[PDB]
Amino acid sequence: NETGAFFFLINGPEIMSKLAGESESNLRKAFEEAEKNAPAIIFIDELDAIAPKREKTHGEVERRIVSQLLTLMDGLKQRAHVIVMAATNRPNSIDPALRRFGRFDREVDIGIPDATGRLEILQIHTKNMKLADDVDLEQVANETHGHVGADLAALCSEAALQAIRKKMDLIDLEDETIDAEVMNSLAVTMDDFRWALSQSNPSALRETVVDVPQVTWEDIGGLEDVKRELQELVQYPVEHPDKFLKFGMTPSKGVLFYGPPGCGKTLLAKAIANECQANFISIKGPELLTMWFGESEANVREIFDKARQAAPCVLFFDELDSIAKARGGNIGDGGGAADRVINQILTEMDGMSTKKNVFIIGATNRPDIIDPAILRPGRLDQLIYIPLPDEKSRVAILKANLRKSPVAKDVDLEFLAKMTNGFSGADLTEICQRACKLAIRESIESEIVPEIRRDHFEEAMRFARRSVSDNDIRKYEMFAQTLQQSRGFGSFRFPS
Amino acid sequence: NRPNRLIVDEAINEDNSVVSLSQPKMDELQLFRGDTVLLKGKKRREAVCIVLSDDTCSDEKIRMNRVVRNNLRVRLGDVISIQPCPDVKYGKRIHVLPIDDTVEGITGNLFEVYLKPYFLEAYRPIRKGDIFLVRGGMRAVEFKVVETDPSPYCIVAPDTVIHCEGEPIKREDEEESLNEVGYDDIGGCRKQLAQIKEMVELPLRHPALFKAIGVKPPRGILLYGPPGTGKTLIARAVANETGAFFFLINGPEIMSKLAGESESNLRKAFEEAEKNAPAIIFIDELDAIAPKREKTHGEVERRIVSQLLTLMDGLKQRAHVIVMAATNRPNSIDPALRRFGRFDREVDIGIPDATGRLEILQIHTKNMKLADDVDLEQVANETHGHVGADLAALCSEAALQAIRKKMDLIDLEDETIDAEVMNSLAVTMDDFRWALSQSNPSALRETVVDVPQVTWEDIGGLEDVKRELQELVQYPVEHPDKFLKFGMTPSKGVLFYGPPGCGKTLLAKAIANECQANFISIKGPELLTMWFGESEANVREIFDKARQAAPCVLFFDELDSIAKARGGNIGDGGGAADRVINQILTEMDGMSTKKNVFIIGATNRPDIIDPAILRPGRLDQLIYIPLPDEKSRVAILKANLRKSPVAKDVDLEFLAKMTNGFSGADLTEICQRACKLAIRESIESEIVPEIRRDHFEEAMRFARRSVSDNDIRKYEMFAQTLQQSRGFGSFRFPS
Numbered sequence A: 001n002e003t004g005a006f007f008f009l010i011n012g013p014e015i016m017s018k019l020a021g022e023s024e025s026n027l028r029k030a031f032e033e034a035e036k037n038a039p040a041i042i043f044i045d046e047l048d049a050i051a052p053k054r055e056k057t058h059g060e061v062e063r064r065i066v067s068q069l070l071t072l073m074d075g076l077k078q079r080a081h082v083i084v085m086a087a088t089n090r091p092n093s094i095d096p097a098l099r100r101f102g103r104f105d106r107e108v109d110i111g112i113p114d115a116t117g118r119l120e121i122l123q124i125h126t127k128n129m130k131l132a133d134d135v136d137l138e139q140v141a142n143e144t145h146g147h148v149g150a151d152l153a154a155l156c157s158e159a160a161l162q163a164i165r166k167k168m169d170l171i172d173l174e175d176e177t178i179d180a181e182v183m184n185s186l187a188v189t190m191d192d193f194r195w196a197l198s199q200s201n202p203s204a205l206r207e208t209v210v211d212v213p214q215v216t217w218e219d220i221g222g223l224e225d226v227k228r229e230l231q232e233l234v235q236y237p238v239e240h241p242d243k244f245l246k247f248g249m250t251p252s253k254g255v256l257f258y259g260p261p262g263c264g265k266t267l268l269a270k271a272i273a274n275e276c277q278a279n280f281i282s283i284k285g286p287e288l289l290t291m292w293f294g295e296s297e298a299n300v301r302e303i304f305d306k307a308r309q310a311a312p313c314v315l316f317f318d319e320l321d322s323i324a325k326a327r328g329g330n331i332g333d334g335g336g337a338a339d340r341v342i343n344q345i346l347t348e349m350d351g352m353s354t355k356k357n358v359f360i361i362g363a364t365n366r367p368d369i370i371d372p373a374i375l376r377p378g379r380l381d382q383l384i385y386i387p388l389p390d391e392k393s394r395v396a397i398l399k400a401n402l403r404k405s406p407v408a409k410d411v412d413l414e415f416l417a418k419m420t421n422g423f424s425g426a427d428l429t430e431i432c433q434r435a436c437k438l439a440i441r442e443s444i445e446s447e448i449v450p451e452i453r454r455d456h457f458e459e460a461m462r463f464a465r466r467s468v469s470d471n472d473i474r475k476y477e478m479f480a481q482t483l484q485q486s487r488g489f490g491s492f493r494f495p496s
Numbered sequence B: 001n002r003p004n005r006l007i008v009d010e011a012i013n014e015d016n017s018v019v020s021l022s023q024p025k026m027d028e029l030q031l032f033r034g035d036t037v038l039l040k041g042k043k044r045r046e047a048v049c050i051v052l053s054d055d056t057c058s059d060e061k062i063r064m065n066r067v068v069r070n071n072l073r074v075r076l077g078d079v080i081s082i083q084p085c086p087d088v089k090y091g092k093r094i095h096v097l098p099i100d101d102t103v104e105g106i107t108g109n110l111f112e113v114y115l116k117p118y119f120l121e122a123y124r125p126i127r128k129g130d131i132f133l134v135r136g137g138m139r140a141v142e143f144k145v146v147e148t149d150p151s152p153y154c155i156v157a158p159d160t161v162i163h164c165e166g167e168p169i170k171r172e173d174e175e176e177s178l179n180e181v182g183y184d185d186i187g188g189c190r191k192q193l194a195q196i197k198e199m200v201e202l203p204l205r206h207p208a209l210f211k212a213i214g215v216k217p218p219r220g221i222l223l224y225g226p227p228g229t230g231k232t233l234i235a236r237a238v239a240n241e242t243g244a245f246f247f248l249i250n251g252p253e254i255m256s257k258l259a260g261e262s263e264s265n266l267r268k269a270f271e272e273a274e275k276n277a278p279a280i281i282f283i284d285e286l287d288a289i290a291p292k293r294e295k296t297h298g299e300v301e302r303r304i305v306s307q308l309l310t311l312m313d314g315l316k317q318r319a320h321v322i323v324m325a326a327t328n329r330p331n332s333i334d335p336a337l338r339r340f341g342r343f344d345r346e347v348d349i350g351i352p353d354a355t356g357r358l359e360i361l362q363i364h365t366k367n368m369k370l371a372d373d374v375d376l377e378q379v380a381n382e383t384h385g386h387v388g389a390d391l392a393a394l395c396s397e398a399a400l401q402a403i404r405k406k407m408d409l410i411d412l413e414d415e416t417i418d419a420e421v422m423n424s425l426a427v428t429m430d431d432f433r434w435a436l437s438q439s440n441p442s443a444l445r446e447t448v449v450d451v452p453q454v455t456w457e458d459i460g461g462l463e464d465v466k467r468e469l470q471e472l473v474q475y476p477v478e479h480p481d482k483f484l485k486f487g488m489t490p491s492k493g494v495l496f497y498g499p500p501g502c503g504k505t506l507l508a509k510a511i512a513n514e515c516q517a518n519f520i521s522i523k524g525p526e527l528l529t530m531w532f533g534e535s536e537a538n539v540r541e542i543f544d545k546a547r548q549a550a551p552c553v554l555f556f557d558e559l560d561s562i563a564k565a566r567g568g569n570i571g572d573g574g575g576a577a578d579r580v581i582n583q584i585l586t587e588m589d590g591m592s593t594k595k596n597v598f599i600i601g602a603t604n605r606p607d608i609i610d611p612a613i614l615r616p617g618r619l620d621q622l623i624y625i626p627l628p629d630e631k632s633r634v635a636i637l638k639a640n641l642r643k644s645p646v647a648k649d650v651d652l653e654f655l656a657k658m659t660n661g662f663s664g665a666d667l668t669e670i671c672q673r674a675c676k677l678a679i680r681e682s683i684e685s686e687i688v689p690e691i692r693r694d695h696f697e698e699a700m701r702f703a704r705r706s707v708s709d710n711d712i713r714k715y716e717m718f719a720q721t722l723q724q725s726r727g728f729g730s731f732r733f734p735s
């Protein structure tokens, strides 16, 4: 519509609804009809019901229709200036014949929008209607994290409809045509939208979502030594290519995060995505075990392919040693440290192009069970260790954690930093959560005050449980000192 | 705003001429309670009935029955003007006669069987031209007023007498037949019927509202539930009570046609209803229509599916038709029809509970009479695994068995049965109990959803845990402001660990009854079935069932059952990870935290639980249930002995003392064994009707503790290691 070209829509089931021969004639007649009206755009609604030639191998007319479409694709020897377009929800459900050059060489992958993108959808679908002063679209874009752009249209339509059933229920204007002096005055409040949020059922919650986290370096307390190392590894080769091309030395492929659990390895991977203005794909532990238990290790190929087209992007693998713990862990089993899920990842990392704006981050907590096949040069060489937080670093963790909720001034976090010795970064989050629950409990109890008090933190000290034990602390130190081994050669000089 | 017009609504009473109004509403008219009220709606018909009292209906509305709605030719969602009429009026000459459509096959007198036990001590202002239905004689009979003294000033009174000629009349299409289905034929479905009522009222009662505005009304309304729940009944009721044309499309009916004709039927079924707007198009079954999951066979099946798909999204406004479909298996629908614009609204209707089932029995037995010793409260308890259609067959068989028992030796060799004997035919317990045995339920393998009736009064002791559970799932749902202001998210779930028999299932069941939410229970073998069957994808449906049934709570009994199957304490060559729990962990990450759902985990061996579930975001709240104390064991026995009356010499305080390692479940078999002795001695001495003290003394010889003595210390050492509240006793600040 914005280019002045004729638009032709070809529906999927529309072709199939015809009998034998007529469906063949419709595709043929749909091309020269748009050819005379050049320029033109030919759009295909769905391709799953048109060319499902993957495992069907059934029906005599299906293959004929697929071949007719294939012949009409490559048969456009210039002549007109028509551009054919198609849309498929499942990238894997397209026959490779149509993916050949000359028929479909350009691929566009559009994903679920983020909160900023979803807010624009709400603004677009509500531009013709008015809203009250206490109505803000910033809040509704946060809880609808697993909503598609079409879900928001239904949400706002239901919110608008519920207003009629609440304000125009007892009026009963028995008129053949509605007026305008009442429709304009019909406002929509929070109570109308909140009811529609509950009734809305998202239709996309199992696929891998891609989003850029809003967490920055200010939300990570301490660990200033690691931040400079990460900023100096993924930001120079992308913004100083000349110094890398002149010396001819290739940039690093990925980084590995190992250390005690709870130090916040996920935050380090999330913060580097927001600084580089790139995407972020996260894979959890059970996501890897699903393929190992399901005897289907080919699902990771789609995960790797999704990150490539979404350039720039970063790849994150949480607790890669989860499969090793499932087969014995420290004691192991009758086999080695090799499995089938990591085998496919290793094969795919070898074939991936190093010139793309992609990066892989590995996270683990047990470095003694990691397969050594990933440490050899070409796959994963940079190993970053996150030690236990110190006294000077624990104050910043609490200061960053207490930013979302206003606190009082008598809370002396410097004192809480001192008695905490083996407390990790995640070991302090439940303390604040338990302290905050007490404020709500006492407010509701005393309702029949609107500030957190000092006594809330004192009570939460009785349930201070450390997630890490004391025996495994030495195992990380002995591993780190063995890996580094910077002894012997103290300081050597030359005579001249 | 002329405060004399009210909106109609369905009545809650089973009487015919009853008008329900609230106490604050009644004084606005300045009128008394016992009198006659005149109703003026539309189509220049009038109606007069008796007004009653209500206290829970609404701010301003009128509740009127279905039979009185037919006289005014009005439907749900319509406005009606009400005015009083305080005048005394009697009756002199009444001439009424029924229609042959309901009295076909009835002989004998038509006065002492239906007219005398209908108007006695009633004083109902029967208006001229009104149509009323009488229930009795184990059938449905309706009459009509043809001619009488000129209305108004007509009320039935004992002074006047009723006369009838004997010949019936012929009805027209102006009046609606009361034999059809309606909103009063639905029982148990309260939360889910309201969604359909509100989703269909606007685009049908006001077709011109959506024609002018650009709001897109929902088109497809897909229905769920096991076969027999009443998906067709609801579809026909919502079309009959809204004045819209109802079109029924059967599943096998399309398939029975040859090639091409089946294609033409679907196409011709749409514009036929388009001209008769508004209309409702209902599809009986979809399993035989679009089974495009693993079939991949047949050339006409895909063509029919694509034709239906094209007819779905091809409804570019034009008319104001609403298409509806019903499928018993939610998983047996192709994703193409689930796309937006074709089927975006999904309604899941389940098996009704005892209260819902009792309404089904009342609905299906309203035309027949029952004896004084007949109560429907008992039969709604044993039929826990019965569908709404099973109860119709049960009551039909109960009614039929009465004929084979009372009308077996009579042998009335007559061409037409009479009415003086059919009405007198009563149905007793012996007729229903025989039908209960012969009835075969058709739904006993699916996961049933019910709200337990157990409250906190049935749980003895454990008062510390109850407050912790009441303070975790009830504040974030009823104080959202204090959670949104501080910005801190509520807890996802809770874990119950401790010695077996303490009653972890009761804690999860009691929290569902207090929150007025559903309850889904998964036992131990239910988890092992997927682990042994190499099919861990069945838990996705379990998770999805709880979401739509909001609010709901999720319960997982003995989650460590799979760990014990692979070695238990000693384990095996692998770790603590498996495939069943992997899917649960993956699904708990993707579930929306803003829904009114909760997950409760129960276990007895905390030393074999996978630590992957304890990390923040999945399951953080761990609640330990210790051994019951002496002060708590008295309450357990007191709550357990509530179902059966006991004597006063049973000193439970003494029984509390010698019990040391006895858990909550360890005391139930003691009471059961004591109660069995009473029955045994009553039957033995038959050739007394109270439990005696000596019954409990004998049961003490078989007092077996389910828990051993070695595992008691393992729970204490685990709890003290988990808590570890030593060291920091009491710290203060200098200033």
Ligand SMILES: Nc1ncnc2c1ncn2[C@@H]1O[C@H](COP(=O)(O)OP(=O)(O)O)[C@@H](O)[C@H]1O
Pocket (backbone or CB within 6 Å): A219, A220, A221, A222, A223, A261, A262, A263, A264, A265, A266, A267, A397, A400, A401, A424, A425, A426, A427, A429, B616
């Ligand atoms: N260094 C840190 N600074 C601030 N917050 C932290 C830090 N480490 C952990 N957290 C908090 O602890 C929570 C749990 O982190 P977790 O998932 O245990 O990290 P990891 O996966 O690296 O062990 C996170 O929500 C995070 O906000």
Ligand SMILES: Nc1ncnc2c1ncn2[C@@H]1O[C@H](COP(=O)(O)OP(=O)(O)O)[C@@H](O)[C@H]1O
Pocket (backbone or CB within 6 Å): B185, B186, B187, B226, B227, B228, B229, B230, B231, B232, B233, B360, B363, B388, B389, B392
């Ligand atoms: N919830 C219910 N209340 C009253 N009657 C019911 C109910 N469910 C089923 N029935 C009765 O069962 C009969 C058969 O219903 P059926 O067509 O099997 O329903 P569905 O199509 O939903 O399986 C109907 O005539 C109906 O009267």
Ligand SMILES: Nc1ncnc2c1ncn2[C@@H]1O[C@H](COP(=O)(O)OP(=O)(O)O)[C@@H](O)[C@H]1O
Pocket (backbone or CB within 6 Å): B458, B459, B460, B461, B462, B500, B501, B502, B503, B504, B505, B506, B636, B639, B640, B663, B664, B665, B666, B668
């Ligand atoms: N604290 C209690 N108070 C009352 N009854 C109890 C209690 N604990 C257990 N029971 C009774 O014991 C019976 C068996 O419970 P059980 O299934 O062993 O619980 P769990 O599954 O938690 O071990 C239940 O029917 C329940 O009525």
